[PDB]
Amino acid sequence: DRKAPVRPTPLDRVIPAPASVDPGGAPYRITRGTHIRVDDSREARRVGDYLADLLRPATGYRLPVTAHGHGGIRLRLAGGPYGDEGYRLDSGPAGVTITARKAAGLFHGVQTLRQLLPPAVEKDSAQPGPWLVAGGTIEDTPRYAWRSAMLDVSRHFFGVDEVKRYIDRVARYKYNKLHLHLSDDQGWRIAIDSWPRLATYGGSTEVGGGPGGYYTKAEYKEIVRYAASRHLEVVPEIDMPGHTNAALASYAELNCDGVAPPLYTGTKVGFSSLCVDKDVTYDFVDDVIGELAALTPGRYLHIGGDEAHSTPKADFVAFMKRVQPIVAKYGKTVVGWHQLAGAEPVEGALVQYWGLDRTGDAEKAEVAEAARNGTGLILSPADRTYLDMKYTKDTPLGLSWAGYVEVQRSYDWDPAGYLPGAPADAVRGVEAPLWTETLSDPDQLDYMAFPRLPGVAELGWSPASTHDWDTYKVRLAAQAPYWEAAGIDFYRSPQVPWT
Numbered sequence: 278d279r280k281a282p283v284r285p286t287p288l289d290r291v292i293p294a295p296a297s298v299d300p301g302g303a304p305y306r307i308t309r310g311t312h313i314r315v316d317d318s319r320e321a322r323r324v325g326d327y328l329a330d331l332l333r334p335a336t337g338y339r340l341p342v343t344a345h346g347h348g349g350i351r352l353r354l355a356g357g358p359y360g361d362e363g364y365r366l367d368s369g370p371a372g373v374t375i376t377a378r379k380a381a382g383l384f385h386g387v388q389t390l391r392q393l394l395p396p397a398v399e400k401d402s403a404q405p406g407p408w409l410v411a412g413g414t415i416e417d418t419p420r421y422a423w424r425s426a427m428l429d430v431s432r433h434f435f436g437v438d439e440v441k442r443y444i445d446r447v448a449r450y451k452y453n454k455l456h457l458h459l460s461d462d463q464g465w466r467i468a469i470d471s472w473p474r475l476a477t478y479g480g481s482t483e484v485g486g487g488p489g490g491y492y493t494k495a496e497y498k499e500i501v502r503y504a505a506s507r508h509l510e511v512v513p514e515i516d517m518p519g520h521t522n523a524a525l526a527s528y529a530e531l532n533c534d535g536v537a538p539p540l541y542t543g544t545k546v547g548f549s550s551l552c553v554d555k556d557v558t559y560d561f562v563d564d565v566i567g568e569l570a571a572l573t574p575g576r577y578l579h580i581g582g583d584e585a586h587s588t589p590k591a592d593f594v595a596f597m598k599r600v601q602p603i604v605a606k607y608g609k610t611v612v613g614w615h616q617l618a619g620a621e622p623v624e625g626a627l628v629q630y631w632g633l634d635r636t637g638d639a640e641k642a643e644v645a646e647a648a649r650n651g652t653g654l655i656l657s658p659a660d661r662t663y664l665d666m667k668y669t670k671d672t673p674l675g676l677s678w679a680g681y682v683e684v685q686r687s688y689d690w691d692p693a694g695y696l697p698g699a700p701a702d703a704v705r706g707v708e709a710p711l712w713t714e715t716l717s718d719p720d721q722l723d724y725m726a727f728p729r730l731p732g733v734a735e736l737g738w739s740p741a742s743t744h745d746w747d748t749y750k751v752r753l754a755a756q757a758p759y760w761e762a763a764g765i766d767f768y769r770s771p772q773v774p775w776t
């Protein structure tokens with residue numbers, strides 16, 4: 278009875294592990310007449326309709342959303358110790374109530390509810406149920422404010438609908454930021470009016486050749502809107518000065534030798550560079566960041582800065598000193614890969630650490646020092662949270678430059694004491710990047726993202742006190758029937774006792 282258990286799943290059996298779980302009493306049961314009662318506000322109703330849409334297919338129930346009466350499922354906004362993202366979930370025969378200070382908290386509460394319900398909830402046709410929700414109370418708040426997932430749409434382009442699909446995958450685990458790698462050597466994915474060829478030419482292909490693609494302003498705005506509806510703040514990235522071949526191939530003048538390189542369809546990195554000694558280079562950067570910032574309601578703008586190996590150190594430093602201010606000029610907070618820590622991060626900047634266990638002390642020191650100087654840290658170790666990394670030598674997709682990364686390794690660590698000498702309060706959170714050199718379709722994205730994606734989300738959300746592999750793997754194993762019913766392919770790691 279994997280699909281429709283006789284009894285409800287444990288109240289604590291959810292990912293991320295909730296801050297506080299107090300089981301008790303009888304469970305709630307959703308029946309054909311259940312109403313979803315929300316506050317008389319747009320934001321409240323919005324979450325109600327979202328919940329209704331998630332449950333209608335499998336239950337076949339009407340589930341009307343209204344601001345009157347005593348619905349069996351109540352979503353209420355009230356004062357409380359739940360911050361901007363926390364919530365309280367009360368379940369019992371009298372009904373299920375989700376309380377939070379803001380919509381995001383209610384949304385997060387819903388993500389927990391869909392896990393309390395049985396696997397059959399993932400089906401698209403009416404199911405027998407029962408639609409039980411374990412009884413008791415859950416009080417939940419996040420450990421870190423930066424819990425993101427990155428999707429590389431430059432190596433292989435993924436359209437609006439495919440991105441919306443990935444957004445729904447991550448929303449399940451309370452991620453609150455979506456980092457989009459919009460440009461690299463194999464493609465430029467965002468239309469820039471001031472530089473038309475970036476998209477029309479720079480976006481014409483991708484890894485392996487053939488058609489590429491890109492987002493028009495309208496498509497990008499739609500992705501941001503959809504992400505916002507799933508409470509994901511979009512963090513766009515335009516990598517510079519390295520990983521810039523798409524742009525360089527589009528405009529000969531940007532190149533040091535004034536010759537446009539061919540469009541790149543390989544899978545290597547580090548060979549491209551904007552010409553730091555040219556003035557046109559900074560007109561280009563200003564134009565792009567200005568247009569991107571206008572399309573970005575979010576607070577951050579990622580300028581990359583990784584593997585600028587065709588850019589001498591001194592030039593890299595000079596380049597970043599010159600471009601960082603451009604971000605603030607357009608009202609945004611700059612973010613960069615940790616290489617930026619060696620190029621004087623401006624005040625308020627954050628750096629994304631993608632180092633490994635084996636990374637040299639000198640490099641780790643430079644990053645820990647930036648943290649001491651006030652730079653916020655986003656942790657995404659290549660040998661931990663890079664979802665494109667192979668599980669073992671036999672994985673049919675992904676890369677292995679950072680070694681292999683099985684499920685336990687990806688989960689078994691603590692962000693607070695990860696980087697030696699780095700102040701714990703400098704750690705803003707974590708990120709799970711999914712690079713696409715080897716992934717060309719949504720199903721392949723799923724196979725590499727799952728089952729590690731949920732784990733990284735827990736590291737960003739759950740209290741350190743709840744972290745434990747032996748008990749987490751049981752909660753992870755329980756997701757199997759849900760993913761199977763949802764049509765979500767995943768790697769059945771031998772380290773997990775799959776349900």
Ligand SMILES: CC(=O)N[C@@H]1[C@@H](O)[C@H](O)[C@@H](CO)O[C@H]1O
Nearest residue numbers: 546583614631663665676712713
């Ligand atoms: C910051 C960063 O990760 N840069 C590259 C990235 O462009 C590539 O897609 C990935 C694949 O694992 O390898 C990294 O070294």
Ligand SMILES: [Cl-]
Nearest residue numbers: 442445446763
């Ligand atoms: Cl989904």
Ligand SMILES: [Cl-]
Nearest residue numbers: 542543544545
């Ligand atoms: Cl090559």
Ligand SMILES: [Cl-]
Nearest residue numbers: 544545546547
């Ligand atoms: Cl390489």
